[PDB]
Design a protein around this ligand. Structure first.
Ligand SMILES: *Cc1cc2c(cc1C)nc1c(=O)[nH]c(=O)nc-1n2C[C@H](O)[C@H](O)[C@H](O)COP(=O)(O)OP(=O)(O)OC[C@H]1O[C@@H](n2cnc3c(N)ncnc32)[C@H](O)[C@@H]1O
Ligand SMILES: *Cc1cc2c(cc1C)nc1c(=O)[nH]c(=O)nc-1n2C[C@H](O)[C@H](O)[C@H](O)COP(=O)(O)OP(=O)(O)OC[C@H]1O[C@@H](n2cnc3c(N)ncnc32)[C@H](O)[C@@H]1O
Ligand SMILES: CCCCCCCCCCCC[N+](C)(C)CCCS(=O)(=O)O
Ligand SMILES: CCCCCCCCCCCC[N+](C)(C)CCCS(=O)(=O)O
Ligand SMILES: O=C(/C=C/c1ccccc1)c1ccc(C(F)(F)F)cc1
Ligand SMILES: O=C(/C=C/c1ccccc1)c1ccc(C(F)(F)F)cc1
Lengths: 498, 495
């Protein structure tokens, strides 16, 4: 048996951040990784046609200080996603160019409903503790309804309900009827709320890494050398003896003081446990699926949309569109002109039936109509990745909680099981679902183990992160009118009173 | 490597039924069972205090002809669950004795609401094909709603909503807000409707096996001998080569022409596949949890409830009661007097934190109140099983579908993956979730392999079952008034 202090299961950003912190603290770590590569839900493809492209996790932004610090220490740089020209909101077959993070509306009644929808998501968010969403005062009531039921109660206009539906689909790669209202409200609040999560400039989608996000996991692998074991899927964890035994699919045995599970929670199911998991984790890892997404990148000779004063951002409502959201994916140098689009939730299932060529054709025709541009029909190259296919991911971007599960099972997500500690973005309390959350969770799990070993006091398990000097965070602000304009039901109450 | 015609993964009723059919046709079968026992979600414990007790699946009834034929061939007999005396509905702190399958109501508005709720479950089921619930005309509408939403829409009275909620909790060991309305309506319809699924006399709970349901899987293991490998959890399936390779956790390798997966769908996640599973199956097996239940049996010196003209059936509304439903578990001789109770769904999760003795005390004080008898406070023995604990079940009774999953992934459940065919009660089209469904799905999956081998024609894969001579089904009837009384909003539209 190969002996060490800590086995880390999974060489994603979370596992690799954990392994590096333990290695830096002078412990002997092994990383057991299922795939022939590190990075997990991050994957940077390199070829002559694209140079490099993120097929998984890509965007970082302000308030994501841990992934920024980690990446800067490994010698990586960021650049800004193109948001110089106009965004497009495409609704009912027509494109409406706009500026600012929120797609605007002119109908006064529709304006009240839209303003009240975003405001109410944040209002409800402020009731939900980041580190214990089940302690929200109405946790039970909100967890026992889907986001569909919540939008049916909140949205007094089809226009707000359609944009709200797209917001859920895009943010968590799941249908409104699939997800807990409590869990979704938590997810948005723990990323800093509606404006921060939806924004390119000043939000989640502001930046990409020069050379791709896969470099984070690769460069930590370089520092760890042969401590990373590729094509070692873990099958078996035994805690009945003094040292934890960890067995891989190729029959290798690792022996450790402690284990970090840095895999998506449900992929816990791929491991046979001795003794059996406690009841609540046993059931929790069968109740927490990952969302569905195809990330598609169409290449063009030039970023032609910019010549029409379009930045490349498209927000596209409704059923017929294969893609509901795009960003400019052009290199910072201005070359390898490209549009990144997501095929979301049920469409990732429905359209997987097509060939790569048939999906490229549908995306080109959509982009031609939305951009009013025949050049969109002249792609030079295409890359895509259906994350629904991945045995060792289960989906992307992250784990969603169906109705009733977060209040019954949420406590056990990062609860240690004897000498097993839980990392993975899903166990984060800030930007859970993101690369940021992966770094928070890996470092926190590593420090739980350092605490258990008596190397650090308890108050060092959770540590705040200094703000990036490279990517300073502009605060989120509201106007007086945004704060106090009535809802549609509010307005009707005012009317009736008069 | 150990070579055979078919490896069956799982030695529950479904895997054993499949293995027996294939063995009987002259194929060399191996059954790989993760546990040190067969039976899976069935488990019969024997000791001097109980003689025998079903701690998992127990009840069989009319229209369940496959489990009744298989058990009969294995030498098993049934006896009737005691329903001679009165059932009890305990509502707002008081016991209301009754007869007939449906707890009655006296308020005329509440009466319209109750009548409408049961009738509407069956009306909606009539449009849901048993073999394809996703082809229901309103499949997407019904799938994108929870049973909580449907009950909030349908039930104008708290009385009807409390009993409908208990119905869902009892039937599928899950909360109304956890489950798809489409999936739940399918589940009821594919057991023959509300009356058939809730009934003791002439329904699903009519009978038990003399000596326990465990004997079904045990006696098929007896027939198959050392073709059954106990403590062989399957970890890896490789279909890249000429023969399928199946590896176990103890590093044994089995080589076969075909595989039957006879495990709960989600427990497919415990197996690493080469090549990877197709996308839709890869995601489906992360979306399909099993429900939560503690099955509890309190033993008494005598079936004392019978002295008060109670049969031992208790229907107990509300949050406070640990147990919402009981049946008499007394043996047919009138000895080993016992009450079987279920601790359902969230209560299985909440009350798991207590000790065994603390659960016994709560159950005995509840039974004392409902049965109005101090004798309930004097148990002679207790047995219980928390099915939430089981690494190789994931829960009980069966797999539930959360909103949106059945329409998007339902077609995947019995779709073959190269030379892997799918058994398990979850894949049945009649009494899916039951021992009956297990037999249906095991035999159908075995016959899919006999067809792939050219041994039987396509039209023999699915096979009707002659009706049991021992347990014949009596028709389900309704009254003129049940069919035609208006709903509450019906009565309001008239006013
Ligand atoms: C898929 C995706 C996700 C994503 C995104 C777009 C797509 C298409 N966009 C993002 C974005 O722009 N910005 C961002 O910050 N996040 C974005 N995401 C999410 C992001 O990729 C993830 O949150 C993050 O990468 C997750 O990191 P974590 O380290 O927690 O998880 P992982 O990447 O899944 O790594 C787990 C590793 O474990 C291995 N594995 C699995 N099972 C085993 C077993 N049994 N034994 C050993 N190793 C195992 C996996 O192979 C993986 O490497
Ligand atoms: C738990 C339970 C279920 C139940 C019930 C009450 C409770 C508390 N009441 C029932 C009732 O009164 N009447 C009835 O008809 N059903 C009732 N049920 C449900 C019933 O028990 C089940 O529907 C039925 O037993 C299901 O059988 P099936 O054969 O489909 O599935 P299983 O019993 O779970 O068997 C699966 C076997 O596979 C083994 N396993 C699991 N993973 C592996 C791996 N990786 N490798 C090898 N073997 C594996 C399991 O150990 C099990 O033996
Ligand atoms: C008069 C009926 C209006 C329905 C409006 N919607 C938005 C559909 C529901 C509001 C629910 S709530 O009334 O705010 O609870
Ligand atoms: C009154 N409840 C029963 C709450 C809703 C009526 C159902 S409906 O939605 O109005 O038909
Ligand atoms: O929540 C998000 C966007 C919401 C939104 C944007 C524009 C208009 C309305 C909603 C959003 C969240 C995450 C991602 C990521 F991580 F995958 F890249 C992309 C987008
Ligand atoms: O649906 C069931 C009973 C429903 C019911 C009975 C009386 C009043 C209201 C609902 C019911 C379903 C299954 C089981 C079993 F086989 F798992 F034990 C037991 C009971």
């Amino acid at each position: 048996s190969n002996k060490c202090d800590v086995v880390v299961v999974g060489g994603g950003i979370s596992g690799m951040a954990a392994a590096k912190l333990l290695h830096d603290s002078g412990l002997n770590v092994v990383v057991l990784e299922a795939r022939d590569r590190v990075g997990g839900r991050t994957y940077t493809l390199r070829n002559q046609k694209v140079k490099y492209v993120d097929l998984g996790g890509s965007y970082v932004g302000p308030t994501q200080n841990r992934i920024l610090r980690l990446a800067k220490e490994l010698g990586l740089e960021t650049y800004k996603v193109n948001e110089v020209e106009r965004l497009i909101h495409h609704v009912k077959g027509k494109s409406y160019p706009f500026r600012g993070p929120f797609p605007p509306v002119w109908n006064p009644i529709t304006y009240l409903d839209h303003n009240n929808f975003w405001r109410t998501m944040d209002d409800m968010g402020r009731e939900i503790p980041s580190d214990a969403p089940w302690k929200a005062p109405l946790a039970e009531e909100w967890d026992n309804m889907t986001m569909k039921e919540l939008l049916d109660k909140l949205c007094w206009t089809e226009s707000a309900k359609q944009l709200a539906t797209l917001f859920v689909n895009l943010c968590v790669t799941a249908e409104t009827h699939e997800v807990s209202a409590l869990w979704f409200l938590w997810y948005v609040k723990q990323c800093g709320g509606t404006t921060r999560i939806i924004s390119t400039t000043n939000g989640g989608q502001e930046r990409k890494f020069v050379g791709g996000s896969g470099q984070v996991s690769e460069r930590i692998m370089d520092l760890l050398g042969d401590r990373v074991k590729l094509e070692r899927p873990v099958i078996y964890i035994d805690q009945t003896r003094e040292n934890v035994l960890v067995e891989t699919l190729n029959h290798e045995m690792y022996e450790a003081k402690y284990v970090i599970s840095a895999i998506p929670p449900t992929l816990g199911m791929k491991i046979h446990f001795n003794p059996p998991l406690p009841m609540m984790r046993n059931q929790m890892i069968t109740r927490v699926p990952l969302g569905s997404v195809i990330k598609c990148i169409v290449y063009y000779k030039e970023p032609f949309w910019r010549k029409k004063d379009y930045c490349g951002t498209m927000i596209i409502d409704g059923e017929e569109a294969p893609v509901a959201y795009t960003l400019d994916d052009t290199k910072p140098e201005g070359n390898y002109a490209a549009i990144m689009g997501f095929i979301l939730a049920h469409k990732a299932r429905k359209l997987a039936r097509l060939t790569k060529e048939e999906r490229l054709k549908k995306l080109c025709e959509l982009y031609a109509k939305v951009l009013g541009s025949l050049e969109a029909l002249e792609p030079v190259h295409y890359e895509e990745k259906n994350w629904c296919e991945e045995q060792y991911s289960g989906g992307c971007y992250t784990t969603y909680f169906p109705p009733g599960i977060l209040t019954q099972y949420g406590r056990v997500l990062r609860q240690p099981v004897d000498r097993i500690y839980f990392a993975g973005t899903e166990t984060a309390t800030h930007w859970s679902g993101y690369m940021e959350g992966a770094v928070e969770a890996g470092e926190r799990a590593a420090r739980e183990i350092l605490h258990a070993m008596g190397k650090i006091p308890e108050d060092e398990i959770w540590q705040s992160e200094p703000e990036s000097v490279d990517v300073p965070a502009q605060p989120i602000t509201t106007t007086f009118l945004e704060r106090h304009l009535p809802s549609v039901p509010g307005l009707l109450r005012l009317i009736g009173l008069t």
